[PDB]
């Protein structure tokens, strides 16, 4: 096994990033470490040493990031338990410490694993050296050591207490970072439910902040018994039908929604945005938490029969509220023709909407998308269709319902999921882009064409590290379809103008990204033009011709001293130059005689001809 032992680990780590299901790749290492660990420790241990820097740095990066609970539990386990004895691990010890604090939190088997590694490290590293390496993490490590004493498992506590004793005085040394305290920022009454007794017919208002959160936590939990799941659903349901005011019926409702004007008048062009959302006040925070509880209670079996007909009928209600609040007939003043995305459209404690805003539904839908358990995307995707369906029916036309100000928030909020650091949160965004693209009118997609393009590129750019359980692979496909959906030639003047304008903007962004240092986004930007070159009859250079202003100062590198940029950018400048020139129309003829071209051409030459290490190994290199 000594031969191609590096290939197993080196490939496993790099493959795990791109692969859709990395869990097997990391489980492979866990199997490897157990087998090698304590069973074959003559040559593999020596053969393992070269792997330690990248491997520990790798594994350290993964646990530092945020993945699914079961995934994270494995990661902290791999950072520890490596088949390297006490010695030869000290140089990389700082990288191991961050897992150690993580281990002391979480699963019991991890806590014991964390103490087990900490226990041995305490005895063999002499206090002064070990404590120094604990300084970066001591603020949270010690608080974890103190906390684990209170844990119920006696074996965990006794071991935790023993190590604290071994930490002679360091266990009680003053902490630069004090223990974080729990403070309530909002001094307002949260959501409550009227309760009346027979005693002098007096009434109370028992707060529901914990109950709704507690009920939701039960639905999140993967091992709550079915009875309490049903009760959790009942608490959430009974609360929603409490905050939701039932003050309309049939004739009163029909006349408002059968009105002229809002079915014929131009829909007001108001842009919503959570940029101006002051803060999630406790009601809105609870209301959003209550809704995501309703959405989750719909997906899980043995509760869908009484939930899906509820959430489905509830989603239709909120959209009817949103439309009636921001459509032709009356609309609140915050949605008038020339208004701006003020805070009046979000619930707030000083200038809210004097009543919960319907947009909290979109927040609940977005949070369901970003939930780690991706099964919730399906129920959320149902909601997006339902609000669109009600909007189409109530406004009398598809493209009209899409012009509604509500969808300006949906595109913004769901796209925001692509800017979260968790891969699952990002994947929730990309899936949302795919759904909206394929179920919405072409012209509207053109209106939000660029917004999706930028978000998709960010997901790919952001995930150059451990990519995902298949996100960029999903992002690239969605990006490809997005250009194909929009760039496909048609036929009315209105649509033609939008496509010509939208196509103009998108190519501007793609050309800008040709030379970008990020390899993942760069190559796709290179490839995204190719699909455009095929979708339409226009040649690649004809597509890139108008936006020469962008790349103009780089294809010819403008003698930007070719050391003041890192290696990654130098690849982008060279790769962008290669792609730009290689096109058979060959934009930006790189004439040697012209200045700042001979320089670039000579530099890449000397770079290639550099034979020895010293000349090849420059400070940038």
């Amino acid at each position: 096994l000594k031969p191609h032992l590096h290939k197993i680990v080196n490939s496993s780590m790099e493959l795990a990033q791109t692969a859709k299901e990395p869990y097997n790749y990391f489980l492979l290492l866990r199997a490897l470490f157990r087998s090698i660990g304590g069973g074959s420790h003559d040559l593999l241990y020596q053969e393992f040493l070269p792997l330690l820097p990248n491997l520990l740095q790798g594994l350290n990066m993964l646990q530092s990031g945020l993945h699914k609970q079961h995934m994270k539990d494995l990661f902290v386990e791999l950072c520890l338990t490596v088949p390297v004895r006490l010695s030869s691990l000290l140089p990389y010890l700082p990288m191991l410490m961050d897992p150690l604090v993580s281990a002391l939190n979480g699963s019991q088997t991890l806590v014991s694993q964390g103490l087990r590694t900490l226990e041995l490290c305490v005895d063999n590293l002499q206090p002064d050296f070990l404590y120094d390496h604990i300084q970066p993490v001591r603020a949270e490590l010690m608080q974890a050591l103190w906390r684990t004493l209170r844990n119920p498992a006696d074996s965990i506590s006794h071991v935790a207490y023993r190590v604290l004793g071994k930490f002679g005085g360091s266990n009680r040394k003053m902490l630069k970072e004090s223990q974080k305290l729990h403070y309530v920022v909002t001094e307002v009454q949260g959501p409550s439910i009227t309760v009346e007794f027979s005693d002098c017919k007096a009434s109370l208002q028992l707060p529901m902040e914990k109950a709704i959160e507690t009920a939701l936590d039960c639905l999140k939990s993967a091992n709550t018994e079915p009875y309490y799941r049903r009760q959790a659903w009942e608490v959430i349901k009974c609360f929603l039908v409490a905050m939701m005011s039932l003050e309309d019926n049939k004739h009163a409702l029909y006349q408002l929604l059968a009105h002229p004007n809002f079915t014929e008048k131009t829909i007001p062009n108001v842009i919503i945005s959570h940029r101006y959302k002051a803060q999630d006040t406790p009601a809105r925070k609870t209301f959003e938490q209550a809704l995501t509880g309703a959405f989750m209670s719909a997906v899980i079996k043995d509760l869908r029969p009484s939930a899906l007909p509820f959430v489905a009928s509830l989603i239709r209600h909120y959209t009817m509220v949103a439309v009636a609040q921001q459509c032709g007939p009356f609309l609140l003043p915050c949605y008038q023709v020339g208004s701006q995305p003020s805070t009046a459209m979000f619930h707030s404690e000083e200038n809210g909407s004097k009543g919960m805003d319907p947009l909290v539904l979109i927040d609940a839908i977005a949070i369901c998308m970003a939930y780690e358990e991706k099964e919730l995307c399906k129920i959320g995707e149902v909601a997006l269709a339902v609000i669109f369906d009600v909007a189409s029916i109530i406004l009398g036309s598809k493209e009209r319902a899409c012009q509604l100000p509500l969808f300006s928030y949906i595109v913004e909020r769901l796209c925001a999921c692509c800017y979260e650091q968790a891969w699952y949160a990002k994947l929730g965004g990309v899936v949302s882009i795919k759904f909206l693209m394929e179920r919405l009118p072409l012209t509207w997609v053109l209106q939000n064409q660029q917004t999706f393009l930028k978000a998709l590129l960010f997901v790919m750019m952001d995930l150059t590290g451990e990519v995902s359980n298949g996100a960029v692979a999903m992002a690239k496909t969605t990006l490809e379809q997005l250009l194909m959906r929009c760039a496909t030639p048609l036929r009315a003047e209105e649509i033609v103008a939008a496509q010509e304008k939208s196509f103009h903007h998108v190519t501007h962004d793609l050309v800008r990204e040709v030379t970008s240092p990020n390899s993942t986004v760069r190559k796709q930007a290179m490839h995204s033009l190719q699909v455009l070159a095929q979708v339409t009859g226009k040649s690649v250079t004809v597509i890139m011709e108008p936006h020469k202003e962008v790349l103009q100062d780089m294809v010819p590198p403008k003698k930007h001293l070719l050391r003041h940029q890192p290696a990654n950018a130098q690849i982008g400048l060279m790769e962008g130059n290669t792609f730009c020139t290689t096109l058979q129309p060959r934009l930006f003829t790189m004439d040697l005689n012209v200045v700042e071209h001979k320089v670039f051409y000579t530099e890449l030459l000397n770079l290639c001809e550099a034979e020895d290490s010293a000349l090849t190994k420059l400070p940038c290199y």
């Binding site: 002679g168 027979s198 349901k237 009636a324 240092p517 003041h564």
Partner: protein
């Protein structure tokens, strides 16, 4: 039922349901089946639970009052001790509601509006609307009983919900009860709390009583609870801080002393000695007790012990003539308890053991602790047996250990075979109590963490004796079991903050084995006797080493006197003895004795390295006394003998500098510079800033021919550049000034290794000089450029990334709306400050020339069409005649723009408007977190940049809007940085200066005990500036300034935060208009009336109470708040800093840390007078004091200020060097602003000597309380407050 439950916990379904059928038999007495019926109420199967509930629900009236009595009095909760039985109580009461009424909610504001509600504010469709009405029709059928049934069930599975429900429930339904019912209910509640049924529930963490007692406290009509029981409940049910907090409240407002006794004991139990001390100083009858406590509170246990003994005899004279005066007994008990404590800290273990076993009134507990420390085991065994019978408390963990001590060090012959159970039993028992302590670890937790170190030592101590047994003695494995464990002990020590008594515990216990070890080797080529004696010799020296570090020198001499008894010591250990002995005399006719030991020792034998250190001590000791010329040769011989001893080099330099400061002898200065730099050479990182500070300080005396600088340049080699990182701003101030070309050879070496550390400062300086020059390349600018030039050649990738980051920074500057509003806020503050200066004179006053330029500059940037035509019209002239009329105009325009900026975006993504930051990644370039190099941290501990989070939030800072961009370090943590953009670069640089000082002083606090014992540090934020204008400040969210607290509750109130200042001036004008000048009394009147009408005394307490509902969180936040304000208060006074305006103090809600918003030295513009003598020495104010008055101000604050002041007073910490260097740079900046040579020395030297005057004046300890008590009393005295600037918000 008793047997079935325990044996088979999975088949109770058949039985549990059976007892439900027994409900019929009870009516048709078998009452003894209650402890199974109650176990059926909890169960785990929901179906059975409801079946048992119906009989329980049936058996009582459907009245809220009756059920409350039933839960309190009628019911017994003993049967279900392990359960959190409050769940049933929540279920019991929630079952009395009206389950039929349709669901609703009082908070109509939060309800989602109905579809048709928009009207009131003024085919596919019909099927949908018709279909929808059915859905709404179903909702109308939901009844509140549906929620309560599900609500109640949800509690049973989640204690956290149950715990929060009862606290939110009982006070709410407590209102429902009529005042008659509440009266009777309160009568039953008091006996209920102290009932014995809850006794079973002490161990379980969320104790049912803990949640119950927490709930009642919120009841709006206060429920009277005896202080005696409140102490008990706090002690047992982990309810510590709610009891003390609740006890404090009544103690403040309200035979009225039983409260203090209960409160006093709890503070002692919590080990909050400083808070405990404050309480007793207020109530102590005898003046002796206050003197004793004040001494004991800080150390000097020699004085405190005597002050107690003085009190007792004087009290003894009282007894023979007077009666008992029952109230005095707790005071007498205090002296006996604390005279013993001080006796322990004094190492008077022999006397205590003799005292403890007196003829009568024996004290077995006292004998237990002290008897074993001396070898009097026979007394130990006797004491242990008679205390085991009454081992009453947590001590059980302590008692169990002492069995091991007797087991190991048996009076005749040990067994050490069953000890494993003993140590394990004690360890488990110790953890048991730990579970009973508060949530946040604090001083109350110290004994357990303090003990954990010694409980383990007992276990591995048994391993020592096991090896000594002849059965396994002499074996190599056992011998190496002896060696390693002894080595482990030598490196595992407590911290200096630990009381010397515990330090004895670790070492006295270790001493026994260091004496058992020689015995086995005394039987043979057995050198292990040398190892054993070496251990005891080193251990006793180490144990006595701290006694000096603690300030108890006299006992330290005694401990170092013990080693003489041991027959032989390794010569290396004896060198520590003399070094520790000579150090002891150095810290205190004492010269003769010190000179006796130094001369007598080392008659003819020692090695080179140890001789030098010894001879080094001679010079420093000689230097103290007048005889000094002999010290020089003592250093010369010492330094040159070893030539690599930092102490010789450093101490020698101090002598040369001490002489050279007078007579300005140039050749001596280079002698001082050479010594200092060489000392810092071998020394790495810390413990060299003190020496470097001198080198930079002495560099100011350099003449035109830069001899000292040449001396620096010649000998600044070898000193690793890391040591310089602390002095980058000081170096740059030298580089920009004259003779910089000499230092440029040094900075280039510092930058060559830490490019990010110098580039950001150097970039600021060069760009700062350029703008300075452009106002009207120069050599200083050329010097800065040369550093960057070469510094770009190396790490070219890193520098490009840095500049790229700064280039993108320009996009974070606030828009015009915020920019102008910032000018208004700045202008208004200056007008108020100018306005106060013009007070007393005509209140109308006149607009100052400086104010005109700002307003004239304001219209220039303003002159937005709708606003424009109004502002220019309103500001028809840049201030017409009246200053106090102008502020009204600004305030109106403050409100206009403040609302205007309220609608501005709170978000804007990085990828938008700036691409480099978003495209930045770890592989782009290794760049450390901004401000990482501000302090040369010795260890690696450097966090790279990995990703600029794509979202930046726009936030308000005191009087400006700043962009907060979140960084993600390579470690995965998120560091929120706040991009501060500001003009007036000269002021900004000064603000960083004081922060450098506070960062330089922080290591000072750690070393000593009386400061480390209180967790004292300056929490200086990390600020690195990259511009002449903008800078990055490490802002942690949730930190809101004190003034913002006033606005928050002011906004809730029906007033505006600026009403106090306006009322102060207009009220002053009315009296001034009549003709009478502003007298002192009228200043008190306006302050008093404002404090009683618009700014209530309890403003800050109200916010803290509502923001920290959890008791444990409130106290710790208050304690940390009080401690931090002490350092701020001390720093604002001793360092002669700018006054602490309300907007300056930044309170961190998450941790309680207070960091002042950019302090700065208060130097007179005309001259470097350094005038900081405003009426109140430091901000104490009513509201802040109201947070802490009775104890917090007295005990913690006064003690905290004294502890810090004494810490800096230590001659060992060369604060003179630190202040002189930093101030020198400050003075240079002052000179440039006001418009070199030795005249600089006069300003800085006179300034520092002014600072040390305050430091020593308020640090010196007299025969009683220190001078701090006077100023803090003067700080909050209304006489000084009313005289302060109204903009300072003295009322606040």
């Amino acid at each position: 039922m008793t047997y079935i439950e325990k044996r088979f916990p999975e088949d109770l379904e058949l039985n549990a349901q059976f007892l439900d059928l027994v409900n019929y038999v009870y009516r048709d007495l078998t009452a003894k089946l209650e402890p199974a019926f109650l176990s059926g109420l909890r169960c785990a199967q929901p179906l059975i639970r409801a079946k048992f509930f119906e009989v329980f629900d049936n058996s009582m009236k459907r009245r809220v009052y009756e059920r409350l009595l039933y839960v309190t009095c009628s019911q017994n909760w003993e049967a279900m001790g392990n359960h959190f039985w409050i769940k049933q109580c929540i279920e019991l009461l929630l079952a009395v509601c009206e389950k039929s009424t349709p669901i609703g909610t009082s908070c109509q504001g939060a309800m989602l509006p109905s579809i048709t509600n928009v009207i009131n504010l003024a085919n596919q469709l019909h099927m949908l609307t018709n279909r929808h009405d059915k859905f709404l029709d179903t909702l109308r059928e939901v009844k509140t009983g549906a929620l309560l049934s599900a609500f109640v069930q949800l509690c049973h599975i989640s204690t956290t919900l149950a715990e929060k429900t009862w606290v939110q429930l009982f006070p709410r339904l407590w209102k429902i009860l009529s005042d008659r019912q509440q009266h009777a209910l309160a009568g039953e509640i008091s006996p209920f709390l102290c009932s014995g049924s809850h006794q079973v529930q002490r161990d379980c963490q969320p104790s049912a009583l803990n949640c119950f007692v927490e709930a009642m406290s919120q009841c709006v009509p206060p429920i009277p609870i005896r202080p005696c029981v409140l102490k008990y409940l706090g002690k047992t049910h982990n309810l510590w801080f709610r009891s003390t907090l609740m006890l404090e409240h009544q103690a403040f407002e309200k035979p009225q002393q039983e409260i203090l006794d209960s409160l006093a004991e709890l503070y002692s139990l919590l080990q909050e000695e400083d808070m405990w001390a404050g309480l007793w100083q207020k109530r102590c009858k005898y003046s002796e007790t206050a003197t004793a406590i004040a001494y004991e509170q800080h150390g000097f246990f020699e004085q405190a012990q005597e002050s107690y003994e003085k009190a007792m005899d004087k009290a003894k004279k009282e007894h023979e003539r007077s009666n008992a005066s029952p109230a005095i007994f707790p005071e007498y008990q205090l002296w006996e308890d604390h005279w013993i404590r001080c006796s322990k800290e004094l190492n008077q273990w022999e006397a205590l053991t003799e005292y403890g076993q007196s003829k009568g009134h024996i004290n077995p507990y006292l004998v237990l602790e002290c008897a074993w420390r001396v070898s009097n085991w026979t007394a130990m065994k006797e004491a242990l047996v008679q205390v085991e019978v009454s081992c009453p408390k947590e001590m059980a963990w302590k008692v169990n250990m002492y069995r091991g001590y007797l087991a190991i060090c048996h009076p005749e012959e040990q067994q050490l075979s069953f000890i494993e159970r003993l140590v394990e039993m004690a360890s488990s028992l110790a953890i048991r109590e730990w579970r009973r302590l508060p949530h946040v670890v604090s001083h109350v937790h110290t004994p357990l963490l303090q003990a954990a170190q010694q409980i383990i030592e007992l276990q591995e101590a048994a391993q020592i004796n096991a090896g000594l047994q002849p059965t396994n003695l002499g074996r190599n494995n056992s011998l190496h079991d002896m060696k390693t464990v002894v080595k482990t002990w030598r490196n595992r020590l407590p911290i200096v903050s630990d009381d010397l008594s515990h330090w004895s515990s670790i070492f006295m216990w270790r001493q026994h084995h260091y004496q058992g070890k020689p015995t086995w080797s005394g039987m043979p080529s057995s050198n292990n006797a040398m190892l054993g004696v070496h251990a005891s010799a080193s251990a006793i020296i180490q144990y006595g080493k701290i006694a000096r570090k603690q300030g108890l020198v006299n006992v330290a001499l005694d401990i170092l006197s013990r080693i003489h008894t041991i027959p032989t010591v390794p010569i290396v250990d004896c060198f520590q003895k003399i070094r520790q002995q000579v150090k002891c005399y150095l810290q205190l006719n004492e010269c003769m004795q010190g000179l006796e030991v130094i001369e007598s020792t080392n008659l003819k034998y020692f090695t080179k390295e140890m001789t030098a250190e010894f001879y080094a001590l001679k010079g420093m000791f000689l230097a103290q006394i007048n005889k000094s010329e002999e010290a020089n040769k003592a250093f010369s011989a010492a330094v040159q003998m070893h030539d690599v001893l930092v102490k010789a080099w450093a101490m020698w330099g101090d002598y040369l500098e001490n002489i050279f400061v007078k007579e300005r002898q140039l050749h001596l200065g280079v002698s001082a510079i050479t010594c200092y730099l060489h000392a810092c050479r071998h020394q790495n990182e810390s413990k060299s800033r003190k020496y470097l500070a001198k080198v930079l300080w002495l560099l100011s005396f350099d003449d035109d021919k830069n001899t000292l600088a040449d001396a620096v340049d010649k000998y600044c080699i070898g000193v690793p550049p890391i040591q310089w990182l602390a002095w980058i701003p000081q170096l740059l101030t030298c580089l920009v000034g004259s003779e910089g070309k000499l230092l440029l050879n040094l900075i280039s070496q510092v930058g060559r290794v830490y490019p990010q550390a110098v580039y950001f400062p150097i970039r600021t300086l060069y760009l700062t000089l350029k703008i300075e020059q452009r106002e009207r390349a120069t050599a200083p600018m050329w010097r800065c450029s040369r550093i960057m030039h070469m510094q770009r050649e190396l790490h070219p990738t890193l520098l490009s990334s840095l500049e790229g980051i700064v280039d993108q920074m320009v996009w974070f500057r606030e828009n015009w709306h915020e920019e102008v509003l910032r000018q208004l806020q700045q202008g208004l503050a200056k007008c108020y400050s100018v306005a106060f200066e013009k007070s007393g004179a005509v209140s109308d006053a006149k607009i100052t020339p400086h104010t005109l330029n700002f307003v004239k500059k304001l219209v220039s940037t303003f002159g937005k069409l709708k606003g424009q035509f109004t502002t220019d019209f309103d500001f028809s002239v840049p201030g017409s005649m009246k200053l106090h009329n102008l502020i009204s105009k600004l305030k109106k325009w403050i409100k206009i723009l403040e609302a205007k900026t309220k609608q501005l975006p709170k978000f804007f993504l990085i990828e938008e408007k700036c691409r480099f930051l978003s495209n930045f990644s770890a592989q782009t370039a290794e760049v450390e977190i901004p401000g990482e190099f501000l302090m040369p941290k010795p260890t690696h501990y450097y966090i790279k940049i990995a990703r600029f989070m794509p979202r930046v939030e726009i936030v308000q800072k005191h009087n400006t809007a700043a962009r907060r961009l979140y960084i993600r370090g390579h470690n995965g943590k998120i560091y929120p940085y706040l991009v501060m953009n500001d003009a007036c670069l000269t002021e900004s640089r000064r603000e960083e200066r004081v922060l450098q000082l506070l960062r330089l002083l922080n290591p000072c606090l750690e070393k000593r005990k009386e400061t480390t014992k209180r967790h004292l540090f300056f929490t200086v934020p990390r600020v690195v500036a990259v511009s002449p204008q903008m800078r990055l400040v490490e802002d942690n969210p949730s930190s809101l300034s004190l003034v913002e607290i006033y606005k928050q509750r002011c906004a809730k109130k029906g007033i505006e935060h600026d009403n106090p200042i306006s009322r102060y001036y207009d009220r002053l004008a009315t009296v001034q208009a009549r003709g009478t000048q502003a007298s002192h009394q009228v200043l008190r009147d306006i302050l008093k009336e404002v404090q009683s009408n618009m700014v209530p005394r309890s403003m800050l307490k109200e916010w803290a109470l509502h923001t920290f509902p959890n008791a444990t969180d409130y106290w710790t936040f208050r304690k940390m708040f009080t401690i931090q304000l002490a350092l701020i208060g001390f720093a604002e006074f001793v360092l002669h800093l700018n006054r602490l305006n309300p907007e300056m103090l930044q309170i961190a809600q998450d941790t309680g840390k207070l960091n002042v918003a950019y302090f700065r030295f208060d130097i007179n513009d005309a001259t470097g007078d350094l005038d900081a003598n405003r009426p109140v020495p430091f901000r104490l104010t009513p509201n802040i004091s109201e947070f802490l008055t009775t104890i917090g101000v007295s005990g913690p604050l006064t003690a905290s200020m004294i502890a810090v002041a004494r810490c800096f007073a230590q001659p060992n910490f060369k604060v003179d060097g630190i202040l002189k260097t930093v101030l020198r740079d400050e003075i240079i900046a002052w000179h440039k602003k006001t418009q070199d040579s030795q005249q600089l020395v006069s300003l800085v030297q006179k300034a520092v000597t002014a600072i040390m005057t305050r430091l020593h004046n308020l640090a010196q300890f007299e025969g009683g309380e220190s001078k701090v008590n006077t100023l803090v009393a003067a700080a909050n005295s209304l006489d000084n407050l009313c005289r302060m600037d109204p903009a300072w918000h003295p009322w606040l």
